Amino acid sequence: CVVRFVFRGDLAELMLRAVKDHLKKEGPHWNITSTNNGKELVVRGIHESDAKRIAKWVEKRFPRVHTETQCD
Amino acid sequence: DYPVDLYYLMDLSASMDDDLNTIKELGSRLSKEMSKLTSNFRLGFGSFVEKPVSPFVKTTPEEIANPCSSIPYFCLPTFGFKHILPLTNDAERFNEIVKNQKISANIDTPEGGFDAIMQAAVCKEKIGWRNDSLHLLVFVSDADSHFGMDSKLAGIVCPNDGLCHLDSKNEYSMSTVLEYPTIGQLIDKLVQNNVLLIFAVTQEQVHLYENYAKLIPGATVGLLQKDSGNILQLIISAYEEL
Amino acid sequence: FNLDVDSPAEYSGPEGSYFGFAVDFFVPSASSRMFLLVGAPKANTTQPGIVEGGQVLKCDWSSTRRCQPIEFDATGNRDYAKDDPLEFKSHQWFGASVRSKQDKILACAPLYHWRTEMKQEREPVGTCFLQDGTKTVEYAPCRSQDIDADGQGFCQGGFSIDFTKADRVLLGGPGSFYWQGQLISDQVAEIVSKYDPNVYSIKYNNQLATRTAQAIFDDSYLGYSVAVGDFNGDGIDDFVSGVPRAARTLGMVYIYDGKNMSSLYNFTGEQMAAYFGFSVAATDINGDDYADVFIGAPLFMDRGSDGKLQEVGQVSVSLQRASGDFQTTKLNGFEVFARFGSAIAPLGDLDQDGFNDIAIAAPYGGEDKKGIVYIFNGRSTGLNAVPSQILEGQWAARSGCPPSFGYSMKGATDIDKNGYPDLIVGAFGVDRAILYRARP
Ligand SMILES: *[C@@H]1O[C@H](CO)[C@@H](O[C@@H]2O[C@H](CO)[C@@H](O[C@@H]3O[C@H](CO[C@H]4O[C@H](CO)[C@@H](O)[C@H](O)[C@@H]4O)[C@@H](O)[C@H](O)[C@@H]3O)[C@H](O)[C@H]2NC(C)=O)[C@H](O)[C@H]1NC(C)=O
Ligand SMILES: *[C@@H]1O[C@H](CO)[C@@H](O)[C@H](O)[C@H]1NC(C)=O
Ligand SMILES: *[C@@H]1O[C@H](CO)[C@@H](O)[C@H](O)[C@H]1NC(C)=O
Ligand SMILES: [Ca+2]
Ligand SMILES: [Ca+2]
Ligand SMILES: [Ca+2]
Ligand SMILES: [Ca+2]
Ligand SMILES: [Mn+2]
Ligand SMILES: [Mn+2]
Ligand SMILES: [Mn+2]
């Protein structure tokens, strides 16, 4: 599965940074890549587990962040 | 041995948090390399963020005090443009100032860079541009900018006059009164002030500023890289004149 | 060529109120008298606890020439909870935009802030008041659970407004979704029939609206300015809306279907930061029974005789043809930094020659930046590039904002019932509004 976190506005860098640090702590063995020159953060190589936690954590703590989840 | 006056203008918005460490390196590297062009070398410094006006900035008192509030993160309050260092021969002072710059913040993606360019180029009496020297203005940012008419959303409908308005705190006192300047106005004054404008931006943002450079005579662009010397190369080649 | 500019009816408001910021005509039902509607967004008013809340005044044409506030709202700020204000009307700029359809008056406050029910926030959602006959209700299409920058929290709904022929209100909210912008269209009957004074968020079931998209469209300002007309031959007025920062500051204008809000056409500017889409208008200018599209780009820089770029402003005109194709021509401004094309207003058939005519303003032109308004005629071939009449501002500049004569204007209404539509031109920098009659 893939979770794409899209950050917007001037604070996008600070929000992404905060989320990215959180993700490293929650899933240090995940493939976490910075895309769109720092405006989007993508997590892949996950299996419908973290999707119930990290996607929700970001929406709850950072309501303004847009999240898209895809699974195969 | 023709004199050169370099003004370094730094973007301090939240979006610069990823860039700032390399900007500080460019600043000090520049100061060291500029010494190789002429003995009559001076350099100054200033900074900008955004107009501190709704909807560009939230007006709740907690966020006004700290515009990075609820991230959580601490940063400086939103301001338009500030002039910090009249260009000087004191290269060491320049480096000390640049090294101590801190992050500020606003809400929207574009910044108040055009207000900062106008004041830095126009306020000759406070910046110290020489009568007989090159006038180089280095603009550092990682984003696009607001321009005249965009301020209508904030309730600002009084056109930029192109005049110097720096108070005793070296702050742009008309930041929340006048509209962002237009490009036609920036060109008019950059030409009158004989200032060469350099746009140092990140990759995604380069093409857009290249298009602006094609409108603004004497303007050049470059990529903000860790190998920042690629920008200094523009400054160095600009020194040949002839 | 037939405006009486020698003895116009000049109206004034309280100093600093920006009287004349926005204008329209009021035409009440039956053989009633005609009135002028003049906004004054910084008027102090008599609203308890409110400073510079803004108001709209009804000015009498028939005689006397006095203006009186319209009592849309005569109260202070409502509370959410003890010592916790729900709304902030101070400096909301009510009256910054005013429109009227028959006896219905729609006025809005683009800088109105509201406290989200959820938390003690303060967001510029925007609000409108619609007076229908003797009943006035609050309309707030961007006041909902869709909060914050990603939602409608920064909508500023009411920034731009119009009416459709088929009894609907068209509202732009340029700040929606991180400034992508949103268009909203609602039925007038629905707005009033669903109104309750103790309900802050009302869902309108027959509402049409645009939706949020990818971040690539952020900072575009859709809904910055709006206009209406039939662009597909369905008999239903469609929606024309400017998008001034689209395409990386190149600027775009969109046309959406009047029935299901589906995109039909797109226009694009030619120059970066010309602010193409600043203002739009729609009218049949060549008498071909198809609405034509008028798009301003006030910051456009042309190429002078010396090769130097200079800011004059530009207006593009796209003629609608029966085949669905458009024929586009362009008109440039006449003075540097006058910002020609800042305001465009159809005049209807000003001279009764069978073709609609149109005015284009240049608010910062003329001596002392008093402001200039240009009058152009229509013809079977399109718009006549050369103006037939020029209106000069008559007021000395003051500190802050210049008189800006021509900043905003509205015509196509025959106020004196002489067979020719008249024109109201604002000059808010001097708190003034001026009525120009059309001569036979
Ligand atoms: C005028 O310019 C407008 C802006 O470019 C044009 O509107 C856009 O046109 C593109 C191309 O047709 C549309 O893209 C489609 O997207 C859907 C998927 O939509 C869903 O998923 C996305 C996330 O990926 C989500 O954001 C949406 O809300 C949906 O949930 C694809 O399946 C299509 O193949 C295609 O890629 C844009 O959606 C559309 N709107 C916007 C705002 O971009 C408009 O068509 C132009 N009009 C004219 C006459 O030229
Ligand atoms: C509105 O009233 C306040 C308080 O008296 C005053 O400070 C402000 O200048 C007035 N605004 C006007 C006349 O526009
Ligand atoms: C909108 O209505 C037209 C005309 O009935 C139709 O052709 C078009 O497909 C409709 N579009 C949508 C999204 O409903
Ligand atoms: Ca239609
Ligand atoms: Ca036509
Ligand atoms: Ca005519
Ligand atoms: Ca008349
Ligand atoms: Mn920024
Ligand atoms: Mn950055
Ligand atoms: Mn910004």
Numbering used by the authors:
A (entry chain C): 3 to 74
B (entry chain B): 113 to 354
C (entry chain A): 1 to 440
Q: What does the article say, verbatim?
A:
The RGD (Arg-Gly-Asp)-binding integrins αvβ6 and αvβ8 are clinically validated cancer and fibrosis targets of considerable therapeutic importance. Here, we describe a method for computationally designing hyperstable RGD-containing miniproteins that are highly selective for a single RGD integrin heterodimer and conformational state, and use this strategy to design inhibitors of αvβ6 and αvβ8 with high selectivity. We found small α/β ferredoxin folds were able to scaffold the RGDLXX(L/I) binding loop without clashing with the integrin while making additional contacts with both α and β subunit (α- and β-loop respectively).
To investigate the accuracy of our designed structures, we used single-particle cryoelectron microscopy (cryoEM) to determine structures of human αvβ6 ectodomain bound to B6_BP_dslf and human αvβ8 ectodomain bound to B8_BP_dslf. Despite extensive 3D classification of the αvβ6 - B6_BP_dslf complex, we did not observe any subclasses of the integrin-minibinder complex in a closed headpiece conformation. The secondary structural elements of the designed B6_BP_dslf minibinder model are in close agreement with the cryoEM map (complex RMSD 0.6 Å vs design) and the three minibinder loops make contact with the alpha, the beta, or both subunits of integrin, although some interactions vary slightly from the initial design. In the cryoEM map, the overall orientation of the minibinder is shifted relative to initial design, but the RGD loop positioning is as predicted. Although the second charge reversal mutation (G64R in B6_BP, G66R in B6_BP_dslf) does not form the anticipated salt bridge with D148 in our structure, we note that this binding surface has a strong negative charge and speculate that this stabilizes the positively charged Arg. Of the 13 interacting pairs of residues present in the cryoEM model, 11 are present in the computational design model, including all three salt bridges.
